[PDB]
Amino acid sequence: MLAILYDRIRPDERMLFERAEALGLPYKKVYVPALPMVLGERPKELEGVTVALERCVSQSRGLAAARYLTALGIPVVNRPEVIEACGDKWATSVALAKAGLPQPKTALATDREEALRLMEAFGYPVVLKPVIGXXXXXXXXXXXXXXXXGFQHQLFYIQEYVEKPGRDIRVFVVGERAIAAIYRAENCPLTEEVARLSVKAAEAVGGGVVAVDLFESERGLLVNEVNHTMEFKNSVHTTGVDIPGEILKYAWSLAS
Amino acid sequence: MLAILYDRIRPDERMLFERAEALGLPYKKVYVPALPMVLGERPKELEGVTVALERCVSQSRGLAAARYLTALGIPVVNRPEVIEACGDKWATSVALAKAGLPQPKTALATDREEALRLMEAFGYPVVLKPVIXXXXXXXXXXXXXXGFQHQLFYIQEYVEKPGRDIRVFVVGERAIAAIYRAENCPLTEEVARLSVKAAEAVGGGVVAVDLFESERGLLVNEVNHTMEFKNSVHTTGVDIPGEILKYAWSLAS
Numbered sequence: 001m002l003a004i005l006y007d008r009i010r011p012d013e014r015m016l017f018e019r020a021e022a023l024g025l026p027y028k029k030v031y032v033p034a035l036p037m038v039l040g041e042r043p044k045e046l047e048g049v050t051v052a053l054e055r056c057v058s059q060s061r062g063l064a065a066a067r068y069l070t071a072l073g074i075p076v077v078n079r080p081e082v083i084e085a086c087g088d089k090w091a092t093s094v095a096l097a098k099a100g101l102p103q104p105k106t107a108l109a110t111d112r113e114e115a116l117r118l119m120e121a122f123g124y125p126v127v128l129k130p131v132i133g134x135x136x137x138x139x140x141x142x143x144x145x146x147x148x149x150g151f152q153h154q155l156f157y158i159q160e161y162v163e164k165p166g167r168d169i170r171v172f173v174v175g176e177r178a179i180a181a182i183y184r185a186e187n188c189p190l191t192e193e194v195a196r197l198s199v200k201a202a203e204a205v206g207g208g209v210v211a212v213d214l215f216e217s218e219r220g221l222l223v224n225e226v227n228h229t230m231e232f233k234n235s236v237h238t239t240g241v242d243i244p245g246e247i248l249k250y251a252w253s254l255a256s
Numbered sequence: 257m258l259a260i261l262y263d264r265i266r267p268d269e270r271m272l273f274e275r276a277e278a279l280g281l282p283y284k285k286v287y288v289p290a291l292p293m294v295l296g297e298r299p300k301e302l303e304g305v306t307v308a309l310e311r312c313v314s315q316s317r318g319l320a321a322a323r324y325l326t327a328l329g330i331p332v333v334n335r336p337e338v339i340e341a342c343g344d345k346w347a348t349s350v351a352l353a354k355a356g357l358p359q360p361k362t363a364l365a366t367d368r369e370e371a372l373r374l375m376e377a378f379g380y381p382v383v384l385k386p387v388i389x390x391x392x393x394x395x396x397x398x399x400x401x402x403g404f405q406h407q408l409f410y411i412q413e414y415v416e417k418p419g420r421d422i423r424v425f426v427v428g429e430r431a432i433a434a435i436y437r438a439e440n441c442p443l444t445e446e447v448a449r450l451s452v453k454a455a456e457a458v459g460g461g462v463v464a465v466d467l468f469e470s471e472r473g474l475l476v477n478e479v480n481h482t483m484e485f486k487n488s489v490h491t492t493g494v495d496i497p498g499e500i501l502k503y504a505w506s507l508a509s
């Protein structure tokens with residue numbers, strides 16, 4: 001049977017429970033915070049589980065649990081590798097580059113002084129984002145100011161400022177299919193071009209269930225971010241697609 | 257040519273430079289803190305580099321650079337996957353479990369209350385370590401002490417050790433030396449075999465495997481991605497640096 005791992009119940013999780021009940025798909029709810037994860041001994045709460053859907057709000061918690069499941073030999077929708085490859089912007093941009101996919105000119109610095117040289121070499125304005133878990137720099141003074149105020153110790157994610165003739169698009173990918181999209185809201189009727197780029201980006205980080213955010217730039221479509229635990233409460237009505245049901249079925253088909 | 261990535265120069269790095277010079281192995285030093293890492297455009301400092309040895313003291317820095325090198329299509333000794341699989345104790349224990357290797361009974365909690373239940377279920381005394389260093393005597397001590405590593409508690413059983421801790425230096429598919437954490441521990445087929453498998457379990461490459469000689473036999477404790485060896489060279493009389501440089505150079509691409 002299917003196991004839905006969670007910590008805080010959001011409308012998205014609520015919708016997941018309801019669809020599984022209507023679909024007649026065997027499952028059980030598993031509250032992670034209280035789950036004993038001892039290597040070598042399967043917990044009572046996991047008795048009879050053949051596949052799991054990792055739905056925790058906390059990234060660190062969700063990744064730790066996903067890793068435990070792989071140790072118990074239970075398949076988990078969105079493998080550890082995918083979850084970490086997504087929550088780390090530098091990890092994600094590196095994967096898109098290796099896969100030869102289009103994205104904004106991007107760079108990384110490991111100290112404050114090097115960050116400045118790059119921003120200067122890029123030319124203002126420029127953007128700076130946190131590597132884990134959002135600001136346009138106007139000039140050198142603003143740069144210095146922002147830079148002053150685990151594996152993510154002193155890292156600076158620098159990106160070019162993109163001019164956008166169109167609105168940002170968000171595509172919901174399930175396995176090898178793009179099933180819905182929106183303008184970040186109106187429904188964005190999927191086109192073969194958008195669908196194609198989205199699936200490749202999903203594949204570039206390892207496959208699974210992700211939401212790909214794109215920019216409609218003057219250079220064309222560019223990949224911006226890839227999320228490992230997509231939110232969709234509003235998107236269901238906006239697009240009219242049964243996002244939760246598609247997610248549950250995909251997961252169930254990997255049962256082992 | 258080979259590229260040695262570094263930030264702070266320690267005796268270990270000093271020894272690496274010297275051995276490369278004596279071996280007649282083409283290389284160049286690369287100061288990471290000042291290296292421009294822009295996706296899509298290879299830096300001047302990397303011109304002519306066919307393979308790299310990641311030697312930064314900072315983990316976050318070393319891992320970020322190793323990733324960049326994979327994007328430029330340059331092989332790096334100790335791939336990103338190995339580096340992170342090593343610097344994360346929960347990640348490393350999970351990998352040893354999947355490979356069916358012996359280790360101390362281990363568990364992980366995601367909140368303070370669950371940590372206590374486990375310590376209690378394990379029985380005192382118990383050990384607690386940072387995921388990325390303290391023995392708990394009883395419940396009172398437990399209560400007192402209590403990015404992707406937010407609020408995680410690594411709990412391990414207290415192991416009785418009739419022997420001394422051993423450290424093995426693994427290069428590829430070979431265990432080349434060992435020591436008692438110091439005397440030289442003449443490698444035995446048993447120790448060498450367990451060490452190579454642990455190295456393979458996290459992805460392979462160049463690592464140091466620390467073992468416990470417990471009452472249940474040999475148990476794997478930790479696997480380090482950037483092994484230190486200045487003292488070990490004399491203690492064991494083995495050319496650790498030269499073995500490391502050759503291994504890397506053989507992966508040239």
Ligand SMILES: Nc1ncnc2c1ncn2[C@@H]1O[C@H](COP(=O)(O)OP(=O)(O)O)[C@@H](O)[C@H]1O
Pocket residue numbers: 104127129134159160161162163168213224225
């Ligand atoms: N490099 C960039 N150039 C111009 N605008 C950007 C850039 N990166 C992000 N933005 C803008 O920042 C906002 C959201 O940024 P982001 O941190 O990437 O999160 P998300 O896109 O998932 O909401 C959007 O309005 C987006 O268009």
Ligand SMILES: Nc1ncnc2c1ncn2[C@@H]1O[C@H](COP(=O)(O)OP(=O)(O)O)[C@@H](O)[C@H]1O
Pocket residue numbers: 360383385389412413414415416421466477478
């Ligand atoms: N589970 C354990 N039981 C008893 N002693 C331990 C245990 N884990 C670690 N130690 C002791 O802790 C010290 C070092 O611990 P550790 O954090 O694993 O780093 P390292 O072994 O790489 O030096 C050693 O004296 C070791 O024997």
